[PDB]
Write a protein that holds these residues in place. Structure first.
Motif, PDB file in Angstrom:
ATOM      1  N   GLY A 101      79.851  55.189  32.413  1.00 14.71           N
ATOM      2  CA  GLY A 101      79.769  54.927  33.862  1.00 14.71           C
ATOM      3  C   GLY A 101      78.380  54.463  34.264  1.00 14.71           C
ATOM      4  O   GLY A 101      77.386  54.851  33.650  1.00 14.71           O
ATOM      5  N   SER A 102      78.295  53.622  35.297  1.00 18.08           N
ATOM      6  CA  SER A 102      77.041  53.028  35.786  1.00 18.08           C
ATOM      7  C   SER A 102      76.059  54.058  36.349  1.00 18.08           C
ATOM      8  O   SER A 102      76.455  55.029  36.992  1.00 18.08           O
ATOM      9  CB  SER A 102      77.326  52.006  36.892  1.00 18.08           C
ATOM     10  OG  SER A 102      78.219  51.006  36.436  1.00 18.08           O
ATOM     11  N   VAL A 103      74.763  53.796  36.198  1.00 17.08           N
ATOM     12  CA  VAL A 103      73.690  54.542  36.866  1.00 17.08           C
ATOM     13  C   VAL A 103      72.783  53.566  37.600  1.00 17.08           C
ATOM     14  O   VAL A 103      72.390  52.542  37.045  1.00 17.08           O
ATOM     15  CB  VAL A 103      72.895  55.418  35.883  1.00 17.08           C
ATOM     16  CG1 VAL A 103      71.745  56.128  36.598  1.00 17.08           C
ATOM     17  CG2 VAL A 103      73.786  56.480  35.234  1.00 17.08           C
ATOM     18  N   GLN A 104      72.433  53.878  38.843  1.00 17.57           N
ATOM     19  CA  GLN A 104      71.603  53.036  39.693  1.00 17.57           C
ATOM     20  C   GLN A 104      70.588  53.906  40.429  1.00 17.57           C
ATOM     21  O   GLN A 104      70.925  54.614  41.374  1.00 17.57           O
ATOM     22  CB  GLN A 104      72.511  52.224  40.623  1.00 17.57           C
ATOM     23  CG  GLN A 104      71.721  51.292  41.550  1.00 17.57           C
ATOM     24  CD  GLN A 104      72.610  50.327  42.333  1.00 17.57           C
ATOM     25  OE1 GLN A 104      73.826  50.271  42.195  1.00 17.57           O
ATOM     26  NE2 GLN A 104      72.033  49.515  43.192  1.00 17.57           N
ATOM     27  N   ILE A 105      69.340  53.874  39.974  1.00 18.97           N
ATOM     28  CA  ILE A 105      68.242  54.638  40.562  1.00 18.97           C
ATOM     29  C   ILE A 105      67.357  53.658  41.315  1.00 18.97           C
ATOM     30  O   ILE A 105      66.777  52.754  40.717  1.00 18.97           O
ATOM     31  CB  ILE A 105      67.472  55.408  39.475  1.00 18.97           C
ATOM     32  CG1 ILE A 105      68.394  56.435  38.784  1.00 18.97           C
ATOM     33  CG2 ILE A 105      66.248  56.105  40.085  1.00 18.97           C
ATOM     34  CD1 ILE A 105      67.811  56.980  37.480  1.00 18.97           C
ATOM     35  N   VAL A 106      67.239  53.844  42.624  1.00 23.76           N
ATOM     36  CA  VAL A 106      66.354  53.077  43.501  1.00 23.76           C
ATOM     37  C   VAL A 106      65.221  53.998  43.909  1.00 23.76           C
ATOM     38  O   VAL A 106      65.461  55.050  44.490  1.00 23.76           O
ATOM     39  CB  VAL A 106      67.105  52.538  44.730  1.00 23.76           C
ATOM     40  CG1 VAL A 106      66.166  51.787  45.676  1.00 23.76           C
ATOM     41  CG2 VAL A 106      68.230  51.586  44.315  1.00 23.76           C
ATOM     42  N   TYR A 107      63.989  53.603  43.624  1.00 23.99           N
ATOM     43  CA  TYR A 107      62.789  54.380  43.916  1.00 23.99           C
ATOM     44  C   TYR A 107      61.868  53.507  44.751  1.00 23.99           C
ATOM     45  O   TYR A 107      61.125  52.684  44.221  1.00 23.99           O
ATOM     46  CB  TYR A 107      62.183  54.849  42.593  1.00 23.99           C
ATOM     47  CG  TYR A 107      61.079  55.884  42.678  1.00 23.99           C
ATOM     48  CD1 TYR A 107      61.389  57.233  42.443  1.00 23.99           C
ATOM     49  CD2 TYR A 107      59.738  55.502  42.865  1.00 23.99           C
ATOM     50  CE1 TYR A 107      60.365  58.188  42.318  1.00 23.99           C
ATOM     51  CE2 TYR A 107      58.709  56.459  42.759  1.00 23.99           C
ATOM     52  CZ  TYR A 107      59.021  57.795  42.441  1.00 23.99           C
ATOM     53  OH  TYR A 107      58.044  58.692  42.163  1.00 23.99           O
ATOM     54  N   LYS A 108      61.972  53.638  46.074  1.00 18.68           N
ATOM     55  CA  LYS A 108      61.206  52.863  47.055  1.00 18.68           C
ATOM     56  C   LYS A 108      60.492  53.748  48.083  1.00 18.68           C
ATOM     57  O   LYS A 108      60.766  53.618  49.273  1.00 18.68           O
ATOM     58  CB  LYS A 108      62.118  51.805  47.704  1.00 18.68           C
ATOM     59  CG  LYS A 108      62.500  50.669  46.752  1.00 18.68           C
ATOM     60  CD  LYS A 108      63.298  49.592  47.497  1.00 18.68           C
ATOM     61  CE  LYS A 108      63.504  48.367  46.602  1.00 18.68           C
ATOM     62  NZ  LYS A 108      64.138  47.251  47.346  1.00 18.68           N
ATOM     63  N   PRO A 109      59.570  54.646  47.685  1.00 15.12           N
ATOM     64  CA  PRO A 109      58.687  55.303  48.639  1.00 15.12           C
ATOM     65  C   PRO A 109      57.896  54.286  49.459  1.00 15.12           C
ATOM     66  O   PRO A 109      57.382  53.311  48.916  1.00 15.12           O
ATOM     67  CB  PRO A 109      57.739  56.174  47.817  1.00 15.12           C
ATOM     68  CG  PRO A 109      58.495  56.393  46.513  1.00 15.12           C
ATOM     69  CD  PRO A 109      59.247  55.083  46.338  1.00 15.12           C
ATOM     70  N   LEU A 154      58.645  59.112  37.645  1.00 20.75           N
ATOM     71  CA  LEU A 154      60.072  58.814  37.521  1.00 20.75           C
ATOM     72  C   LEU A 154      60.452  58.874  36.039  1.00 20.75           C
ATOM     73  O   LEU A 154      60.024  58.042  35.242  1.00 20.75           O
ATOM     74  CB  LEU A 154      60.368  57.460  38.191  1.00 20.75           C
ATOM     75  CG  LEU A 154      61.729  56.827  37.852  1.00 20.75           C
ATOM     76  CD1 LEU A 154      62.910  57.749  38.115  1.00 20.75           C
ATOM     77  CD2 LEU A 154      61.933  55.584  38.713  1.00 20.75           C
ATOM     78  N   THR A 155      61.218  59.890  35.662  1.00 24.05           N
ATOM     79  CA  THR A 155      61.692  60.128  34.292  1.00 24.05           C
ATOM     80  C   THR A 155      63.192  59.880  34.213  1.00 24.05           C
ATOM     81  O   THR A 155      63.942  60.415  35.023  1.00 24.05           O
ATOM     82  CB  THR A 155      61.360  61.561  33.859  1.00 24.05           C
ATOM     83  OG1 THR A 155      59.963  61.719  33.816  1.00 24.05           O
ATOM     84  CG2 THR A 155      61.888  61.929  32.476  1.00 24.05           C
ATOM     85  N   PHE A 156      63.645  59.118  33.225  1.00 24.76           N
ATOM     86  CA  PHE A 156      65.062  58.884  32.956  1.00 24.76           C
ATOM     87  C   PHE A 156      65.386  59.107  31.473  1.00 24.76           C
ATOM     88  O   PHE A 156      64.654  58.632  30.604  1.00 24.76           O
ATOM     89  CB  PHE A 156      65.422  57.475  33.430  1.00 24.76           C
ATOM     90  CG  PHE A 156      66.811  57.031  33.036  1.00 24.76           C
ATOM     91  CD1 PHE A 156      67.903  57.306  33.871  1.00 24.76           C
ATOM     92  CD2 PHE A 156      67.019  56.355  31.821  1.00 24.76           C
ATOM     93  CE1 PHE A 156      69.196  56.910  33.497  1.00 24.76           C
ATOM     94  CE2 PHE A 156      68.313  55.960  31.445  1.00 24.76           C
ATOM     95  CZ  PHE A 156      69.403  56.236  32.285  1.00 24.76           C
ATOM     96  N   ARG A 157      66.481  59.812  31.172  1.00 21.57           N
ATOM     97  CA  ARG A 157      66.909  60.138  29.800  1.00 21.57           C
ATOM     98  C   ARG A 157      68.416  59.956  29.606  1.00 21.57           C
ATOM     99  O   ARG A 157      69.201  60.440  30.430  1.00 21.57           O
ATOM    100  CB  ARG A 157      66.456  61.557  29.422  1.00 21.57           C
ATOM    101  CG  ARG A 157      64.934  61.719  29.509  1.00 21.57           C
ATOM    102  CD  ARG A 157      64.475  63.080  28.992  1.00 21.57           C
ATOM    103  NE  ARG A 157      63.011  63.200  29.109  1.00 21.57           N
ATOM    104  CZ  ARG A 157      62.296  64.302  28.999  1.00 21.57           C
ATOM    105  NH1 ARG A 157      62.828  65.451  28.705  1.00 21.57           N
ATOM    106  NH2 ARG A 157      61.012  64.268  29.190  1.00 21.57           N
TER     107      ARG A 157
END
Lengths: 76, 76, 76, 76, 76, 76
Positions: free
Chosen positions: F1-9, F73-76
């Motif tokens: 399944g898709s993952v979508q992380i948006v990080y816009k502080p 921002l950590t992704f695993r």
């Protein structure tokens, strides 16, 4: 039979004078309204006046310090 | 049999005069309204005046310090 | 049998004098409104005035320091 | 099923001060007279020792205002 | 099933100060009289020793305002 | 399944100061009288020793303001 003399006095003392106007806070002194209206006034003799002025005056003839120490050791 | 003399007086002491106007805070001194209106006024003799002025005056003839030390060791 | 004399007096002391105007804070002194209106005034003799002025005056005839030390080791 | 996480903290915070002044600040610490007598000083791991020593801070920020803010988000 | 994470913190915050005058700051620590007597000083691991020493800081920032912020997103 | 992380502080934050005057800053530490006596000083690892020394800092920035902002921002 021997003599050991240790003459080791420690002086950490303070002698201090705080004389006059020290450590005061004056916050917004004055700040009011002064109105003087004077008309047809006459002075035959010496005059002095303060209108709305703020005056701080300190005279200190005193506050002097005197310290005398004598450290005498006599061996015979 | 022997003689040992140690003469180690230690002076960390302070003699201090703080004489006059020291360490004061004056915050917004004056700051008010002064109005003087004067008319047809007459002076036959000396006049001196302050209108709205701010004066800080300090005289210090005092605040002197005098320190005397005598350190004598006599061995005979 | 022997004589040992150690003569090591230590001075870290202070003689100090802080005379007339030290360490004051004057924040926005004056700052108000002064109005003087004068008409048909007459003076026969000396006049002096301060209108709205700010004056700081310090006289110090004093504040002198005198230190005397005598060190004297006599052996016989 | 799908997971949607929306993290929108909005911050319009004001952290402010007005000071007319910061005054006469005096920091004088004085050491005493300290005497340690022993045959042994024996310090064997992670020992902090302060014999007659002084650690001193004079910190005078004109503002000194702190905003501190931690954002943390976790997904597993 | 998707995972959607929208990390959008918004910060418009103001951290401010006005200071009219940072005044007379005096930092004058005085050491004492310190005497340490032993046959041995024996310091073996991670020891900090301060004997009669002075560590002194005078920090006077005209603002000294701090914004401290942290953002942490963890995904597993 | 898709993952979508948006990080816009978004940061528009202001860290500011006005100081009218940073005045008279005096840093004048005084050492004491320090006397350390032994047959041995024996220091063997990670020892810090300060005998009668002075460490001094005078830090007077016109602003001294800080904006510290860690992003992670950590992704695993």
């Amino acid at each position: 039979g021997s003599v050991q003399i240790v003459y080791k006095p420690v002086d950490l003392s303070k002698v201090t004078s705080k004389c006059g106007s020290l450590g005061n806070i004056h916050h917004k002194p004055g700040g009011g309204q002064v109105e003087v209206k004077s008309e047809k006034l006459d002075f035959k003799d010496r005059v002095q006046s303060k209108i709305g002025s703020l005056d701080n005056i300190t005279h200190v003839p005193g506050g002097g310090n005197k310290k005398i120490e004598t450290h005498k050791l006599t061996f015979r």
